[PDB]
Amino acid sequence: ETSGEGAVLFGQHCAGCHVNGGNIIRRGKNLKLATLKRQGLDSTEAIASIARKGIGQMSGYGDKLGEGGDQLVAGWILEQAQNAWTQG
């Protein structure tokens, strides 16, 4: 409901590793749609789960995102992925 809330969470907690849909730690484990889709992760729910609890080399951020923040940041990331991380 609040404009930008997911994007602001992304900047606060995720951009340091994932700005512009990349991954500065494991390059292949990026946030491009094809990369997420290959792993079955191209949904708000899957991304939210990773946001909350982490996966593999990544820790969780659910302790910092606020109630429902995992879903908010996930929805923003999915939109970006769908747009190939560029807008006009």
Q: List binding-site positions for heme c.
A: 14, 17-18, 26, 39, 57-58
Q: Does 13 bind ligand HEC (CB under 6 A)?
A: yes
Give the angle subtended at the CA of 79 by the CAs of 26 and 67, to the nearest 5°: 85
Query: Contact region for Na ion (CB under 5 A) — 22-30, 42-50, 63-71, 79-87?
Result: 79-87
* Closer residue to ligand HEC in complex, CB, 25/84: 25
Q: Considering CB distances under 5 to 8 angstroms, the limit depending on partner class, which of Na ion, ligand HEC, none binds residue 84? A: Na ion
In angstroms and rounded to an integer, the radius of gyration of the C-alpha atoms of the chain is 12
Neighbours of 74 (CB within 10 A): 25
Give the angle subtended at the CA of 38 by the CAs of 36 and 39, to the nearest 5°: 70
How far is the C-alpha of 42 from the C-alpha of 63, rounded, in Å?
23
Q: What is the identity of the amino acid at 10? A: F
Window 69-88: contact mask with ligand HEC (x via CB under 6 A):
----x---x-----------
Q: What is the identity of the amino acid at 77? A: I
Site residues (vs ligand HEC, CB under 6 A): 13-14, 16-18, 23, 25-26, 29-31, 35-36, 39, 41, 47, 50-51, 55-58, 61, 73, 77
